[PDB]
Write an enzyme that holds these catalytic residues in place. Structure first.
Site, PDB file in Angstrom:
ATOM      1  CB  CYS A   1      43.703  40.964  30.727  1.00 13.74           C
ATOM      2  SG  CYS A   1      44.954  42.004  31.477  1.00 13.74           S
TER       3      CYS A   1
ATOM      4  CG  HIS B   1      46.550  42.018  34.888  1.00 22.51           C
ATOM      5  ND1 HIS B   1      47.047  42.775  35.910  1.00 22.51           N
ATOM      6  CD2 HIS B   1      47.511  41.979  33.937  1.00 22.51           C
ATOM      7  CE1 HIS B   1      48.249  43.209  35.593  1.00 22.51           C
ATOM      8  NE2 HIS B   1      48.566  42.741  34.400  1.00 22.51           N
TER       9      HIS B   1
HETATM   10  C1  LIG Z   1      44.800  43.834  30.967  1.00 20.86           C
HETATM   11  O1  LIG Z   1      44.878  43.879  29.568  1.00 20.86           O
HETATM   12  C2  LIG Z   1      43.586  44.365  31.504  1.00 20.86           C
HETATM   13  O2  LIG Z   1      42.473  44.056  31.106  1.00 20.86           O
HETATM   14  N1  LIG Z   1      43.880  45.146  32.508  1.00 20.86           N
HETATM   15  C3  LIG Z   1      45.238  45.279  32.620  1.00 20.86           C
HETATM   16  C4  LIG Z   1      45.958  46.061  33.468  1.00 20.86           C
HETATM   17  C5  LIG Z   1      45.352  46.941  34.510  1.00 20.86           C
HETATM   18  C6  LIG Z   1      47.323  46.047  33.336  1.00 20.86           C
HETATM   19  C7  LIG Z   1      47.967  45.277  32.370  1.00 20.86           C
HETATM   20  C8  LIG Z   1      47.199  44.473  31.535  1.00 20.86           C
HETATM   21  C9  LIG Z   1      45.852  44.501  31.687  1.00 20.86           C
END
Ligand SMILES: *[C@@]1(=O)C(=O)[N]C2=C([C])[C]=[C][C]=C21
Ligand SMILES: *[C@@]1(=O)C(=O)[N]C2=C([C])[C]=[C][C]=C21
Ligand SMILES: [Cl-]
Ligand SMILES: [Cl-]
Lengths: 187, 187
Positions: free
Chosen positions: B105, B125
């Site tokens: 992510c 992500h």
């Molecule tokens: C992830 O888990 C992350 O690290 N950042 C993020 C965002 C901004 C949205 C959705 C999922 C994630």
């Protein structure tokens, strides 16, 4: 007014099946109470992740009722839920008030134990089917998520996102579920 | 001898991205240490799930090295990882020894912060891409899971099972990954 979810957390709960719905429901703006079956102390989940509950079940019960009562799986967690008179009381109350009851993996076997939702179409983990079907009190489904009458069920860790988003749809609608879904990077 | 994983758990970590890999790796027979960045005390994750670590990072470092170092995401968790000199030291050591580094992510942005794995092909992500790509030090990928040199990356909560199973495959092989996968009821 925000919808409210009660997630009952017992020793041996599957931690993925606990955390995924908690997290996704909170993303949906649902007020989630992670309630410890045994009390207020941390809970050792099936794969040894230790989670501190928000409250004991005893105390969370006092703040009900809830828009959804959620039963994670994990065989030993589900067995602990099945043996609990407090869980029986909570589920009976929720059923009496025509509120949503959601359970995943072996979690639905606690519905059998507590005589909840007989006649409903349900799914479980494949390995929990025979237990759930003892007596033919439910109609079995192989759908990844199933919903009939009050009763929303699902199969396993790998269906937890789908299960959680179904709960979100039931409480907050299809549009909120879709908005919550997109940033998750699901298939 | 069992393979060993270090999962570094910081305030603001995405709890799904933490628990899914922990659980799946343990299903694979990997010995997993959930190490608290801040110390031994419970960690408040991004969606307020509170997880008790197995050990402080300070103490877990003493029991290394590990076959994989895992960096969950959550923006604020990743920022805490990025700011940590202890994390820098652990990752440099792991890189020096040609061991696996895995991040999901926003987690991969800590690799940028600590100058780890430059030149590798990586994913993040979508919302973390611009941060990760500042300077053009990596090559960006939209694959759900990416692996290049030492560096295994993935995109979000919804890719966490795929990420975890990739780690399992890298450590324990394709057959163990497939055996662990089947009971999960993944799509
Ligand atoms: C992830 O888990 C992350 O690290 N950042 C993020 C965002 C901004 C949205 C959705 C999922 C994630
Ligand atoms: C579920 O999490 C569960 O409750 N039971 C089970 C089994 C036996 C296997 C895989 C997943 C699960
Ligand atoms: Cl189980
Ligand atoms: Cl985040």
């Amino acid at each position: 007014a925000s919808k409210r979810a009660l997630v009952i957390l017992a020793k041996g709960a599957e931690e993925m099946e606990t955390v995924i719905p908690v997290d996704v429901m909170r993303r949906a703006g649902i007020k989630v109470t992670v309630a410890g079956l045994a009390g207020k102390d941390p809970v050792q989940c099936s794969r040894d992740v230790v989670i501190c509950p928000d409250a004991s079940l005893e105390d969370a019960k006092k703040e009900g009722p809830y828009d959804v009562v959620v039963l994670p799986g994990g065989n030993l967690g589900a067995q602990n839920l099945s043996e609990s008179a407090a869980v029986k009381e909570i589920l009976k109350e929720q059923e009496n008030r025509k509120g949503l009851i959601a359970a995943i993996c072996a979690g639905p076997t606690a519905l059998l134990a507590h005589e909840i939702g007989f006649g409903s179409k349900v799914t479980t983990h494949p390995l929990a089917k025979d237990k759930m079907m003892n007596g033919g009190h439910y109609t079995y489904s192989e759908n990844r998520v199933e919903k009939d009458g009050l009763i929303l069920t699902s199969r396993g860790p790998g269906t937890s996102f789908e299960f959680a988003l179904a709960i979100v749809e039931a409480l907050n609608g299809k549009e909120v579920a879709a908005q919550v879904k997109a940033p998750l990077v699901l298939k």
